[PDB]
Curated annotation (Swiss-Prot), chains A, B:
The gene is tgt. Transmembrane segments: none annotated. It is an enzyme of class 2 (transferase). It comes from Zymomonas mobilis subsp. mobilis (strain ATCC 31821 / ZM4 / CP4). Binds 1 zinc ion per subunit. This is Queuine tRNA-ribosyltransferase.
Length: 350, 350
């Protein structure tokens, strides 16, 4: 397969469906990328892995793919969002054993290289919400400078340039002129994919969607658009409606460990007593393995008993719900009925 | 299949291998019965289930088999070992919501009936270790009276008598005359199986084996012998050498949640730094699913990262190790080489 080939097979309104081809596999889009721990690609947390066991160590152990036994594509973040600051980058000391750490566009790239990622994220500067226009512009401009450094560092490592892909990240907070500036800088540098950054910060769906309505058409139409940190099922459906192709969110896993299950009728809190005698599966349309075999009542019980198996079935369910959702979105766009699906989705979910 | 048919296919010294046939399936012996949460039979905790969700409720929900989705045989304990005392039984208040509870040979039987167990344990009186001969004799005599009440209550419930089986429990602490007395009472009442009770109480392997050497031949040879609460891999091999056919122990699951893995080279503490870069699977001969796919180094990492998946792989590994051990014991006895296996087992395990 090629290093990277994005192809759009069908469209409806702003929504798109198609595929990304890479050496380690094909990624069907719109895509949900679960955390490392039906998916075509998963996410590696660079910041976490850098702290334990370390990037050198993971490289020594054969790379991330062999380490976690996953031989399909992997997307790593830059590590900075999770993180002594300056134009050069950032230095921090580890909480695990006080070791001193430095992150920069160059060092971030090097670390994702050591990890062996297939999709590398440029290193940028988080923009707090809310931000003044002044602060948003200053942060965005530094991010675009860091985007150029990331590109160069990526391109100077032959093995990465030839087998991996680089995404640039749009910043600019919620201001349209800054977003446009950011989009133009990014396209002038040129990347394999364009992420929309800065929108997973407590702004509320309304504002998120507003900023996506003008932000996504600024990005190159023939490249994948990645909405970082998003999100709930209804955020995904609305962002796909606005042109996003890729998503990641800790929601399924965390929800999975704190007793919450996603269903087509809305999220449910399975620890609630109203589920104690409910013989229906987690979700009635879910084709997932948990859903095949066990009832809400038994999972309620598991979790209530503090049994580990319960959180496990819950997480497995949630992960599978998210992939079925993306599958329903792909098929609906491909069939010219995504507009309908979305409306039916909401009526029932809410 | 019959209600209950125990058949001994082969012998070596005191060890036996064969099968138990019941309506819901065949149980190959010597057997390890894991907790509800390769096994031919599992264990239900009666005391726990009685407190949550309740026996009535589980019956309402279709019985334990349908509730946990397990359609093979299930053995339930009496509930008293986990537990206001008198010759009639015992009353206790729940810690979950202060509800008042009573246990007795009759009520224990009724509850295991409501749970739908295939193998029912008579209700007896735990004997603390150490015990004076006087106290051991008094506790044993009450247990044999309770054994007769359990038999009668079991026999007065047509559905149980016809589709389930009852085991009696030998008591008597570590005194041989009491054990013999207990064995004779039990055989005079008559049960489908005979458990050896009172030996999972911190006495140390030496004393356990000593008491098994004279206790097991007192039980009827043509019925299964169940060693309750035992145990570590090396306790099982030695108790099989002394004539036991059935075992249960929380070891695999708990060990599984507290970072400890069983291997043919002894238990390992996977959280230890010496495993951080170990690419070997949990155990090299283990055919288990974890062992297929993941390294000690990645499971070390999982657990160190607090990830739930890790404890899950560990427990799965431990459960599978125990079934492979029982399988190795069955085959070795059937082949006339159990004496050899046991010696080789120890050399490597220790
Ligand atoms: Zn499901
Ligand atoms: Zn294994």
């Amino acid at each position: 397969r090629p290093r990277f080939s994005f192809s759009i097979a069908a469209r409806e309104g702003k929504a798109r469906t198609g595929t990304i081809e890479m050496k380690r596999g094909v990624i069907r889009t719109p895509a949900f990328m679960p955390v490392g721990t039906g998916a075509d690609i998963i996410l590696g947390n660079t910041y976490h892995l850098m702290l334990r066991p370390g990037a050198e160590r993971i490289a020594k152990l054969g790379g991330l793919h062999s380490f976690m036994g996953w031989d399909r594509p992997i997307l790593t973040d830059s590590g900075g969002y999770q993180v002594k600051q300056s134009e050069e980058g950032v230095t921090f000391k580890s909480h695990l054993d006080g070791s001193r750490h430095m992150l920069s566009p160059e060092r971030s790239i090097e670390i994702q290289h050591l990890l062996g990622s297939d999709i590398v994220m440029a290193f940028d500067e988080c923009t707090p919400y809310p931000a003044t226009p002044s602060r948003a512009a200053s942060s965005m401009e530094r991010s675009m400078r860091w985007a150029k450094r990331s590109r160069d560092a990526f391109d100077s490592r032959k093995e990465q340039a030839e087998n991996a892909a680089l995404f640039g990240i749009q910043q600019g907070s919620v201001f349209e002129n800054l977003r446009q500036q950011s989009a133009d800088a990014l396209a002038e540098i040129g990347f394999d994919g364009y992420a929309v950054g800065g929108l997973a910060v407590g702004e509320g769906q309304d504002e998120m969607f507003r900023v996506l309505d003008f932000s996504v058409p600024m990005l190159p139409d023939d490249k994948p658009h990645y909405l970082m940190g998003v999100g709930k099922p209804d955020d995904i459906v609305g962002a796909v409606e606005r042109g996003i192709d890729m998503f990641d969110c800790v929601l399924p896993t965390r929800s999975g460990r704190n007793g919450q299950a996603f269903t087509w009728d809305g999220p449910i809190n399975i620890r609630n007593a109203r589920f104690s005698e409910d013989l229906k599966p987690l979700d009635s349309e879910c084709h997932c393995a948990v859903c095949q075999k066990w009832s809400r009542a038994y999972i309620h019980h598991l979790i209530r008993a503090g049994e580990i198996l319960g959180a496990m079935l819950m997480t497995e369910h949630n992960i599978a719900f998210y992939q079925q959702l993306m599958q329903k979105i792909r098929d609906s766009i491909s069939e010219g009925r995504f507009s309908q699906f979305a409306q039916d989705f909401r009526a029932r979910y809410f």
